Design a protein around this ligand. Structure first.
Ligand SMILES: COc1cc2nccc(Oc3ccc(NC(=O)c4cccn(Cc5ccccc5)c4=O)nc3)c2cc1OC
Length: 257
């Protein structure tokens, strides 16, 4: 849920002193946005335009207007934006944090629950595909959990080990290239947040994939889920499924299991 306008009132926003995470953009802080009867916990991305870039404002506003229309629940949605002491991108909070670190710390999560989470990710990706948006950086670190039963895709475009051969070779990014990344993501998920291609460098992964070699079936991963991973890793981009086909397969599978 979003208020009518994209611009939020800075006086209605409270930020935590502690930062959730930093980087070469700014930082992400936990916040609280005051609405009529309730208070909504939010994750606020803060952009200090340190080099006073005149181009930033236009870029951010064009993005916010696109974000205001992206309503699917399987994505981290924008609450709004505010031009205060810094630009603040007020997003939904996904309390449990990244999928990979979550699974790592919670080895008790069942295969059924992992299947549910990966199906929600394919629902979010199907939605982005339908909207002509390519993620470019789809990975388990980029799936944030609101609950153990509610996953949201973050930081979509608007990681060589997650790249489709045509990304590394011909610099071709598409939703089908994101399907390859979704295959790696499914591997990370069923592997409980373990690192893909452990100890390998990006050049070695390429050489491995050209041999027709793929990562093996994770311990306890259902066979049909490993088969779907492997289909996401179809070398030829023309025979690799899109997200509508992947989501429908996960959808049928989930409602039987
Ligand atoms: C528990 O720990 C965490 C929970 C979190 N819960 C939700 C969001 C978080 O951070 C994010 C992730 C992505 C984006 N942003 C995005 O996903 C994003 C997607 C697309 C476009 N734009 C630009 C834009 C947004 C809004 C307006 C204008 C431009 C985006 O920022 N912003 C903040 C969290 C971070 C955490 O720790 C580090």
């Amino acid at each position: 849920i979003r208020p009518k306008e994209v611009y939020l009132d800075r006086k209605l926003l409270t930020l935590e002193d502690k930062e959730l995470g930093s980087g070469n953009f700014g930082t992400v802080k936990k916040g609280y946005y005051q609405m009529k009867k309730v208070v909504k916990t939010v994750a606020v991305k803060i952009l200090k335009n340190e080099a006073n870039d005149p181009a930033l404002k236009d870029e951010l506003l064009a993005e916010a207007n696109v974000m205001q229309q992206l309503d699917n629940p399987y994505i981290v949605r924008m609450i709004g934006i505010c031009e205060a002491e810094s630009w603040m991108l007020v997003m939904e909070m996904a309390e449990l944090g990244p999928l990979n670190k979550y699974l790592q710390q919670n080895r008790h999560v069942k295969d059924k629950n992992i299947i549910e989470l990966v199906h929600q990710v394919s629902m979010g990706m199907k939605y982005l595909e339908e909207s002509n948006f390519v993620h470019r950086d789809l990975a388990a670190r980029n799936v944030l959990l609101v609950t153990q039963h509610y996953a949201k895709i973050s930081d979509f475009g608007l990681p060589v080990k997650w790249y489709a051969p045509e990304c590394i070779n011909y610099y071709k990014f598409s939703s089908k290239s994101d399907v390859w990344s979704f295959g790696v993501l499914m591997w990370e998920a069923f592997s409980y947040g373990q690192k893909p291609y452990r100890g390998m460098k990006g050049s070695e992964v390429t050489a491995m994939l050209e041999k027709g070699e793929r990562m093996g079936c994770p311990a306890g991963c259902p066979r049909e889920m490993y088969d779907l991973m492997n289909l996401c890793w179809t070398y030829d981009v023309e025979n690799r499924p899109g997200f509508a086909a992947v989501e429908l397969r996960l959808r049928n599978y989930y409602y039987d299991v």
